[PDB]
Design a binder for these strands. Sequence first.
RNA 1: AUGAAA
RNA 2: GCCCGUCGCUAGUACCGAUUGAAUGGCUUAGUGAGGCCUCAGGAUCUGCUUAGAGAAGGGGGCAACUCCAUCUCAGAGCGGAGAAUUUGGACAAACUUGGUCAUUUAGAGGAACUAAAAGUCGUAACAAGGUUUCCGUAGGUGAACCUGCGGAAGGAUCAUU
RNA 3: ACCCACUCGGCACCUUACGAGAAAUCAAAGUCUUUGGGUUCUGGGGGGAGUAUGGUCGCAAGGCUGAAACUUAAAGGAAUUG
RNA 4: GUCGGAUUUCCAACGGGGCCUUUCCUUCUGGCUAACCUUGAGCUUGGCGAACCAGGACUUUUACUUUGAAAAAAUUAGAGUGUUCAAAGCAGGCGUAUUGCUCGAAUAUAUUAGCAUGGAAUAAUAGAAUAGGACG
RNA 5: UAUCUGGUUGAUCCUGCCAGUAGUCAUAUGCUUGUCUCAAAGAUUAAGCCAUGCAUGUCUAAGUAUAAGCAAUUUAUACAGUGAAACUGCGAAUGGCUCAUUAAAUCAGUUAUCGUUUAUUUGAUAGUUCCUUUACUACAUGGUAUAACUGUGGUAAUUCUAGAGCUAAUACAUGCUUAAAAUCUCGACCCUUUGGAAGAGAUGUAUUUAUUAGAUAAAAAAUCAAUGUCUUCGGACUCUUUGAUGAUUCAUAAUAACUUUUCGAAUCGCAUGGCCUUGUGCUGGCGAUGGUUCAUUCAAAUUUCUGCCCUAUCAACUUUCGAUGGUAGGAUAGUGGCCUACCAUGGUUUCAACGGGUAACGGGGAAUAAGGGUUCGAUUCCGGAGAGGGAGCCUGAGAAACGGCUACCA
Lengths: 62, 187, 258, 142
Amino acid sequence: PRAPRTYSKTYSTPKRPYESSRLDAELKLAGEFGLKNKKEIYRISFQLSKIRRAARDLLTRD
Amino acid sequence: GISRDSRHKRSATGAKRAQFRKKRKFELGRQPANTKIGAKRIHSVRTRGGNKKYRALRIETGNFSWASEGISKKTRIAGVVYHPSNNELVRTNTLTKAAIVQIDATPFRQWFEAHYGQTLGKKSKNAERKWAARAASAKIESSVESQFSAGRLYACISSRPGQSGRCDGYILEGEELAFYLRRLTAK
Amino acid sequence: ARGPKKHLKRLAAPHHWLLDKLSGCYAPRPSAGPHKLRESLPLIVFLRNRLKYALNGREVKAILMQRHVKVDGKVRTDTTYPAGFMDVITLDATNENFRLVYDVKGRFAVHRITDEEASYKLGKVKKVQLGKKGVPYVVTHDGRTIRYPDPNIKVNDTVKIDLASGKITDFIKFDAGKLVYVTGGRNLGRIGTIVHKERHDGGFDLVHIKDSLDNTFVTRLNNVFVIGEQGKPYISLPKGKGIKLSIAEERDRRRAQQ
Amino acid sequence: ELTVQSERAFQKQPHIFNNPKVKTSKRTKRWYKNAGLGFKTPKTAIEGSYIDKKCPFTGLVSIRGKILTGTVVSTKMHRTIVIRRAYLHYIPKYNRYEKRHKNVPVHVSPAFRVQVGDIVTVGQCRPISKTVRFNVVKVSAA
RNA sequence: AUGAAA
RNA sequence: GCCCGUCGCUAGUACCGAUUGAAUGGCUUAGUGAGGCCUCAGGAUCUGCUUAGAGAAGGGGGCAACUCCAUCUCAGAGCGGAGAAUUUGGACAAACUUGGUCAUUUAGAGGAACUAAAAGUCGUAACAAGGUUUCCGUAGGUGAACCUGCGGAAGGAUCAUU
RNA sequence: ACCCACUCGGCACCUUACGAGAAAUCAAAGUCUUUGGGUUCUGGGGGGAGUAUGGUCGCAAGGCUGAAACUUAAAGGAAUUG
RNA sequence: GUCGGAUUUCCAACGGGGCCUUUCCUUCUGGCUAACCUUGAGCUUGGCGAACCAGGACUUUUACUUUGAAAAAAUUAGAGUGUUCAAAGCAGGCGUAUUGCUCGAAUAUAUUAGCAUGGAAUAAUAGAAUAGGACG
RNA sequence: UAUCUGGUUGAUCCUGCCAGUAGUCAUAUGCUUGUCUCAAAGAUUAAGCCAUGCAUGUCUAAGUAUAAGCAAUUUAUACAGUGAAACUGCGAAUGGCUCAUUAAAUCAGUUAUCGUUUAUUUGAUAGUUCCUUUACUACAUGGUAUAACUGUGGUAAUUCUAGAGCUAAUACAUGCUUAAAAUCUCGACCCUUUGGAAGAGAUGUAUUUAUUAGAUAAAAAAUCAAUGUCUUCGGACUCUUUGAUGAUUCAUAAUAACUUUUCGAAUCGCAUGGCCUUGUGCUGGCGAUGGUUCAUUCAAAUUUCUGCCCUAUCAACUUUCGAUGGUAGGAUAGUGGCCUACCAUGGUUUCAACGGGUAACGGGGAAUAAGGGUUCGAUUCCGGAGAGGGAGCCUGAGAAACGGCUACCA
């Protein structure tokens, strides 16, 4: 009866898992910026992906 | 109870609808009245919203109108003699709408005498002036004159007594009068 | 479902009351009255979620029962009475008078006003008929039923009433070139000065209408509400006066009025 | 259509009391009404001796609501016909249509005499029967 | 004429 | 080298199948048909009015028989009101019995298949001209692949005789 | 009846490959990721299986329509070298 | 001609409205008589009905397409907002913090089908041929 | 963020599948688990069965109180404070649970009710109820129980109830009291005949029937059946009034009656105010409750157009004994084969009818994506259905009610 609480994640896993370049890049980022979680890294990448889709589908317009 | 919906019927293509609901109260029906003559009994039934409904039965007297004069008098009912819907209703002598019955014709007769002073079948200054002014209109036609000679006059019930508790109707005149006497005399 | 509804959930309650989707799973059902279910603002949500004069429904019912409150010059001591469109409410305490009118954002506004502007209101006639005993009469948009009026008053007109009796102060007819107010649709709260209309005989009389920024649109004749003549409104109007500027223009407005 | 009073009952217009006593010009009376929406009450309906209370013009069955147009395909019934509404239902996936028809039946007055192929428009009136809801107001063929 | 399993 | 079929062992899956097979659910002919509801009657019971005559008190009057009205009493008569048990006829129609039918599963002597499984027997049909060029359709024959007859094709071993 | 030139419709042929195709090859098997002229019929790994069942046709042989359970990682096409 | 805002005659383009070129692109009653030929001396007394309207009237059919009214919230996209960030939620912010002041809670989407709608290409669609043919 | 990869070969190109990969408000399970916030949770198989215990009862200043209940009126002799139980009036038809039924059926958008009911609210709205209408009748107001309670009790048990004695009402059954005019009838009487007439009954609302009006593109002429207004009786004749609707036999008004008789306050709390013809005389406020009609509002029920998954190893379906239509009637709150009587033989179909299947309630939506799309949607919100399966029905505005009855089946 209580209107259900919205929930939605703030990250998204990689499409293709094991690419040594990708893994080493996000490991570089975690070990230089002091992180614990590829979850967090994916989260930041997800925000960037959100704004990038917005930027694309806005600058498409006149 | 008697349903009134079409979820119990077949569809128009030839398809039995399925059983979908239970019967309701807003799709119900009830039994006919089968209204008769003599010793007036009127049971009432509760309807949707209060809104009483005088279920006529055994009705001895009713109201009857003369439309060229606009008058309406109370009279008994001899019996039904013709009903287009059913000869069964004719036989068992059951009043419904559109029903052709016979009435006394005597209050209309005596009212006719008091109003025009002109005979049927076979003094004061004011009443004499009244009849003299209303003259030239006691010339109705032959069939109604014969019916006033006989003392049994043809009326049509136009009320819905099973819905109203009222056998009300009107005297026949002219065209439909001829039509219905043709239907009676048809042999 | 076997009879009248009695309860009303949130999310079936309308949008413009601005009731929050948390804080209990039930909403205030408007008991029957001179206005509909959806285009109505109950006094409970009014006092409790527009002014914050109270905090709880118990307190608001306490107020209504001790009779600090009165609508249309009568106490109206019910917790869920419909305060509809154009209506007046009077508070002896603070000697205030709130009016229930619309805003351009499509919500029931809060129009602070004085005692004479409360003592008169406006009402659109919904229809006209002939009552019993040969008494012509009319009926308004707020369930008000009024007798022996002027023949000049015809359908879609508006009447201004004394509020101590049901009699008339004056009336306003429907014709081209009159100031109006919209009630229904995306145009909720507009004020747009009739320019012409169109019939489409058989249903849905339509009207072409434009506000003073030249901006035009079309609306249904049962959704409009005529408020008088060009220039002067017959009442005082809320913030915006029915303009509906763009999202970016309103952004700039508030950022200038930070 | 040989006899207007064919049935056992006396078919007439209710309450239209043609007074047998006075003998004035136009000996019998006839009610009627303009249906509205820009339709016409035909001269055959005006002069008609028929009754047909289920007719919109002379009868008592108000037209209100939807209006439709179609071509007649049946005439084999008594004051009732069936039409055919050829139309095209769209399918978004394949992005193109398909013919469909719905053979609605309608009621028809004696004011029109209709053979097959006569294109016709109707008006939503109340339920005339289990199958029927509509009644014809104009025909558009020969 | 036939020619075991990986 | 590769490969085909019968036969033999092990395990599984499905099919045919006597059993007038067995169940489950829906629709339903016919028969019985509760229970309420509606209408024809019924009348315990209670109860209002009108009188209704007398066993005889009380007082008022011939004050003596006798007379006027109220009275505890009980028939008797109609004028009615409400009125349950029971009841005719009707429509609604639960449920049961009997058949028919539609679907959804299922047991089964035995028979005939299919599949799978490291090393079983009998042959060697096919792949080279595969040792009788293969295959297609049809018919007969036989342990098995298979053979043969009649026509057809090249996926042939020939694109070719001026 | 022949010869020359032209023409329309045919049975096909020789050479290219702009074009196509996985390739053999192909005047269509082209004008298809630069994807659309109109329409019909069929196929969706191999087997089980054109089997079982149910209709339908036939004297019969059999034909037309026509699955599933179950099993498997290949079967299959065209070419290259041995 | 504002010190990177906005204007005129603007040369030109771009799409829109109207008149004529054989192009009636429904007209009768009306009142508006309209655009008034109506003109009083340079601002006067009187033109042909839709440009506002009620009707009489022929309104041959669709498909298409534009625009609008309407499509309950929640959800989705998306504005603002420091729930300590975030998921969230729709709150909050500013005072002389004693009288208090104050913006918000947007906007977008809304298939087919139904109503009105400008168009007339495209696709069909009947029309007057042993003329019961139209203006008359 | 419009992506591919491994596998038939000695190797190559292909078709073609398998496997890999990523996601799911998609579940289960394993192994493990320190914290903050938010939160799904006996749906899938069995809408299978249920012990026990709760889930709707309820009062004010104001319907009824002698609780032989409790404080105290002392402003009150009838109580007038509070107050169990009980009568009464409302509500218990909303909410909540599930998704079994159901494939033009629910449902979604979109229409109508000129085809109907609607408690409750909200705004208006009952001078007309003495019926041999003069004694036929209290209107500073009328009658009857009956509960609670008292006591007698009866069953093993039941929200079991009988017997006897009270008493109340907004419970039942009844019941009069306020104008003025205006037309019909009679009709005394004069009698006139051009014809004038005192006096009497009716008219509120509601039901039922019948009738009339409820409107109106344009201008003049000939008369009278009898002049009709007023007269120069040469005839001047004008004056005339009706709202809405797209459209009605609409709203509405009036004649003539019907009714076994609807409604028109015998109700209640505070405050007690004024006129004097100084009478418990006459008038007066703020309210609550109910009440006929109309309108409104929350609804409700039918209804127009369009749209649904798989099936032809389902091609004809429906119609005896309703299928399609028409006429009339019954029933309905209302149209209408909803049902009956009579009549016509129709209605749907390859543009997939009808029958079968569905681990089918529909939708707002969920997962998932360049585009196109595919799959799911029991599940918080909207509309439906049901209370173990069916059928029936009382009360009520509203139920085919199940935390209400009656029967049958298990």
